[PDB]
Amino acid sequence: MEKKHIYLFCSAGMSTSLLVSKMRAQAEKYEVPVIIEAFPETLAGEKGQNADVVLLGPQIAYMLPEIQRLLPNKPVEVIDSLLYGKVDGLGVLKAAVAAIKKAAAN
Prior knowledge:
Blueprint: E1 4-10, H1 17-29, E2 34-40, H2 44-48, E3 53-56, H3 64-70, E4 76-78, H4 81-86, H5 89-104
Parallel strand pairs: 1-2, 1-3, 3-4
Helix pairs in contact: 1-5
C-alpha cells in the first residue's frame, strides 16, 4: 500500500507527539496514507535516510544547515512557529505533503 514517510525531529522527540497525534487523526479522517513519527535529532542521519520529508521543530531550526548537510538528498524543512504554537495538524500535514511534491514534481 503506497505510504509516505513524514519524520519529525526535535531534541528529545516528546513535545512534537501531540502535533503528530493530531496530524495522524486528520490523516485518518481524510484517508491520507502516511506514516508520521517523532524522533530525537541524533537519529536524523539513520532514520532520515528513509524519510520522504524531514520536519524540524523551530527550536532546532538553526540546525537546518547541519541536518541539510547530513541529508543533502532529502527535503528538510522547519515547522512554522505559529502553526506549532497553534498546534494545527492539518496545516503542517499540508506543508509536509507540499514539500514531498516540491521534490517529486512541481
